[PDB]
Amino acid sequence: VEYDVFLSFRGPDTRKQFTDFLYHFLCYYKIHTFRDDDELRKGKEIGPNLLRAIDQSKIYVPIISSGYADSKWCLMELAEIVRRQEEDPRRIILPIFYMVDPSDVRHQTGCYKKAFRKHANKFDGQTIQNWKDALKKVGDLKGWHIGKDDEQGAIADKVSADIWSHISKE
DNA sequence: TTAATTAATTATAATTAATTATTAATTAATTATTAATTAATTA
């Protein structure tokens, strides 16, 4: 009746490209999945929607993309995932890199440089250091890299069971 | 459906400007005295 898996991704990039199939494939294993498309903006952080499901989730599974560092709504939300995780280690994180190196995520260089080249003219000089401290630790856990040739279909089946193995056996 | 105003939101790109680099290549000049046999002479 509650949520056992909570996703997070980019807007226009992978909302129909691949994450959509995983939502439809996952529902075939009899588990309730949460994905959201509402652009929020109704304020700066909504409570009864995101904040509710965050504490209700069980396996936070982000999906870092190529342009995941531009939306001013994703990063600060990810800062709430990995922060809540460090307080109670009962839950886990299974990131999935996508079309990007597992090196442009630990130092925000490469395809993120100019993203933080303009993000530094608006916000505080400490809030940005809060993101780069949280975004870094995500790029150290285990994760299926998806190269240019790997099957966008076989990976889904392999990763889904790893989410279903931690539920049946508990 | 249009025109018009207000309110926000999202973009990368181009140019100018500066610092930062031992390497590429030839020229030129100096420096390296044996290798080697031949010729001549001597023990």
Side-chain angles (χ1 to χ4, degrees), chain A residues 2 4 7 10 13 18 21 40 48 54-55 83 105 118 124 127 138 140 159:
Chain A
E2 74 165 357
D4 72 33
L7 268 61
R10 177 61 170 122
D13 201 341
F18 160 77
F21 297 88
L40 213 194
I54 279 313
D55 296 3
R83 204 264 311 167
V105 88
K118 62 186 210 193
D124 182 300
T127 323
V138 150
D140 281 13
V159 69

Side-chain angles (χ1 to χ4, degrees), chain A residues 44 72 114-128 131:
Chain A
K44 302 276 210 153
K72 66 172 182 183
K114 303 221 322 177
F116 283 31
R117 187 175 183 177
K118 62 186 210 193
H119 266 21
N121 302 345
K122 284 68 209 155
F123 292 71
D124 182 300
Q126 194 269 7
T127 323
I128 289 187
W131 290 347

Side-chain angles (χ1 to χ4, degrees), chain A residues 99-150:
Chain A
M99 285 301 105
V100 91
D101 312 314
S103 101
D104 262 30
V105 88
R106 289 82 143 147
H107 324 283
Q108 314 97 15
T109 162
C111 317
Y112 290 12
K113 189 62 63 186
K114 303 221 322 177
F116 283 31
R117 187 175 183 177
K118 62 186 210 193
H119 266 21
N121 302 345
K122 284 68 209 155
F123 292 71
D124 182 300
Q126 194 269 7
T127 323
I128 289 187
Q129 186 64 22
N130 195 358
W131 290 347
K132 276 185 268 156
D133 199 327
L135 186 59
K136 185 173 65 53
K137 198 191 72 62
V138 150
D140 281 13
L141 323 176
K142 325 186 179 182
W144 300 260
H145 180 302
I146 290 195
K148 301 231 67 60
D149 296 359
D150 276 41

Side-chain angles (χ1 to χ4, degrees), chain A residues 40-124:
Chain A
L40 213 194
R41 303 153 163 260
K42 296 159 285 181
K44 302 276 210 153
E45 176 65 22
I46 190 75
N49 301 339
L50 267 44
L51 283 216
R52 166 208 34 164
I54 279 313
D55 296 3
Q56 295 288 332
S57 32
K58 181 176 291 273
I59 306 87
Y60 316 73
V61 186
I63 294 181
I64 275 189
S65 164
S66 330
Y68 187 63
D70 297 11
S71 121
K72 66 172 182 183
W73 306 100
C74 308
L75 277 311
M76 84 162 182
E77 182 267 2
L78 184 129
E80 201 71 18
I81 323 187
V82 91
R83 204 264 311 167
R84 176 74 26 172
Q85 143 73 13
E86 281 194 320
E87 164 272 357
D88 189 343
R90 190 176 79 108
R91 296 158 287 202
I92 47 197
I93 289 195
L94 288 319
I96 284 169
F97 308 151
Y98 193 114
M99 285 301 105
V100 91
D101 312 314
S103 101
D104 262 30
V105 88
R106 289 82 143 147
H107 324 283
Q108 314 97 15
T109 162
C111 317
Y112 290 12
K113 189 62 63 186
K114 303 221 322 177
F116 283 31
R117 187 175 183 177
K118 62 186 210 193
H119 266 21
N121 302 345
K122 284 68 209 155
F123 292 71
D124 182 300

